[PDB]
């Protein structure tokens, strides 16, 4: 292909109009064409093009790149130690993959809470207030909340605000075996975020621009969204606040939080004219402000420009959410970290999976190990004739397979009570008996039955462990629960 211009691929939520310019500048003074280009999936498309016809410059979020570089898509990055004293130190290290620079960073991205102020001068604080809120608002024709569901950048936060995370990072190392979307945090999260859905707050289709037409039309109070869309509401007029997102179960809403990022083509005949654009050009004051006004940026990672821009408190919000959440690692395997979510929440959203089943697949797709144990309760029952007769009864669980008492409990009157759980990793069929122990009380003849109980351990259609309890009174064949009845014998 025909190489002499400068070919610079970005999202096309960005201001690349903005960008052009700076291209066009560029132009000027060094008779090279810039040619800026938004295709859809351009981050999917890179790793594929990359054969030619790849851009010689892209850019997205810095938790891309790790993968890319891995690999061999990306140019190493090798600026002036008087370059880099310009941009945040946190922003190098966001594109810093094997100890070596990958990209140059641009901005720092975070998702905010985003209120109209004519329907809502207080947003709520927490995630648990939104529903009775929805119910207010649905009286005068308008919504509470709607944001992007399709893309799980934006309903990570909730999900991650009790507990979900993605990969445990500890000792200046990511452990990509220790993932986090599976635990009792992402479940609730999750189950919040589908109980809306049930209960007609939001709707599973809501995609992005669906969210952005109603928000920028004033038919729903809040959106949710960073700060490249804050350009298309003032044009709308809608009075607006940018605030820090609703806390759920107390906790912040966490959000992934990207530093958006320019990386160099490896296979580009044109490294050193994309390094004279990307450090001359762009990361100046006057570069950054012209993409800026088409499309804000967010927090820059120049420092020099990011000084004025700290002063709008749009931008304290949007670093307000960002040190609530956290910045995205770049190691390769966080692609697929995210189509691992991405289906957990449609699938969970649209009711083809349960909560439960969603992100137990996603842990799998991530990389986590696969769980493969189950477990299982054995339960008793004792029956006494008088309420408030509180006598207690004890019971024993053996193993048959084991000749051996496993545990045994005690009940105070009438009631149920389980052993504590049994796990078992491996199909087959495993045998237990349960009796009752005689009572040391004269004024009471226990019960004599033999429970056998067997627990059968299958694969599912899916190849899940799973585990059924079947108990039979010794004398029969007839399946019967675990009940015992305990009879007084005095007044
Ligand atoms: O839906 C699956 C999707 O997952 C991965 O995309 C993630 C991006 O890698 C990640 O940066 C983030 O993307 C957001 C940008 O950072 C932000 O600048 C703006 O453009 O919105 C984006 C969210 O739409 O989150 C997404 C996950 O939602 C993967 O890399 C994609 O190829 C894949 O299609």
Redesign the pocket.
Same mark, same amino acid.
């Not at 997205?60 to 891309?64: I, K, T």
């Not at 399709?150 to 934006?154: G, I, K, L, V």
């Given at each position: 292909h025909h190489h002499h211009m400068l070919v610079i691929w970005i999202?096309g939520?960005?201001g690349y109009n903005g960008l052009a310019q700076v291209g066009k500048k560029f132009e000027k003074d060094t008779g090279i064409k810039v040619t800026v280009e938004h295709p859809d999936?351009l981050?999917?498309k890179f790793p594929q093009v990359a054969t030619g016809d790849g851009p010689d410059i892209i850019f997205?979020?810095?938790?891309?790149f790790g993968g890319y570089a891995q690999s061999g898509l990306l140019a190493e990055i090798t600026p002036d130690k008087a370059f880099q004293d310009k941009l945040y130190p946190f922003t190098w290290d966001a594109v810093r993959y094997n100890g070596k620079l990958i990209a140059y960073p641009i901005a720092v991205?975070a998702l905010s809470l985003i209120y109209n102020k004519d329907l809502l001068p207080n947003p709520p604080k927490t995630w648990e207030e939104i529903p009775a809120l929805d119910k207010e608002l649905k009286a005068k024709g308008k919504s509470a909340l709607m944001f992007?569901l399709?893309?799980?950048?934006?309903t990570?936060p909730l999900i991650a605000a009790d507990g979900g995370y993605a990969f445990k990072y500890e000792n200046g190392k990511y452990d990509i075996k220790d993932v986090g979307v599976d635990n009792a945090g992402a479940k609730a999260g999750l189950t919040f975020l589908v109980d809306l859905i049930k209960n007609k707050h939001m709707n599973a289709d809501t995609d !992005?621009s669906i969210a952005e037409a109603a928000f920028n039309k004033g038919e729903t109070a809040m959106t949710i969204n960073?700060p490249?869309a804050w350009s298309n509401i003032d044009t709308s007029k809608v009075n607006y606040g940018v605030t820090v997102l609703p806390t759920f179960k107390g906790q912040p809403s966490k959000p992934?939080v990207?530093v958006?990022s320019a990386g160099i083509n490896a296979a580009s005949p044109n490294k050193e004219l994309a390094k004279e654009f990307l450090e001359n050009y762009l990361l100046t004051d006057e570069g950054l402000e012209a993409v800026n006004k088409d499309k804000p940026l967010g927090a820059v990672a120049l420092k020099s420009y990011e000084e004025e821009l700290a002063k709008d408190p749009r931008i304290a919000a949007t670093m307000e959410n960002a040190q609530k959440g956290e910045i995205?690692p770049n190691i390769p395997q966080?692609?697929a970290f995210? !189509?691992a979510?991405?289906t957990a929440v449609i699938n969970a959203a649209s009711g083809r999976q349960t909560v439960d089943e969603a992100l137990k697949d996603a842990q799998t797709n991530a990389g986590g190990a696969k769980d493969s144990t189950v477990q299982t309760s054995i339960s008793v029952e004792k029956v006494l004739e008088r309420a408030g007769d509180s006598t207690p009864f004890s019971f024993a669980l053996e193993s048959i397979d084991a000749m051996k008492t496993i545990e045994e409990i005690t009940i105070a009157g009438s009631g149920k009570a389980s052993f504590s759980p049994l796990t078992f990793t491996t199909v087959g069929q495993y045998t237990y008996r349960v009796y009752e122990k005689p009572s040391q009380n004269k004024d009471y003849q226990a019960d004599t039955t033999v429970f056998d109980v067997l627990v059968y351990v299958t694969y599912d259609e899916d190849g899940t462990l799973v585990a059924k309890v079947i108990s039979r009174r010794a004398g029969d064949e007839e399946k019967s629960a675990i009940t015992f009845k305990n009879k007084r014998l005095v007044k």
């Open positions: 999202n939520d960005k999936k981050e999917e997205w979020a810095h938790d891309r991205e992007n399709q893309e799980p950048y934006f990570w !992005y960073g490249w992934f990207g958006l995205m966080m692609s995210w !189509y979510v991405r």
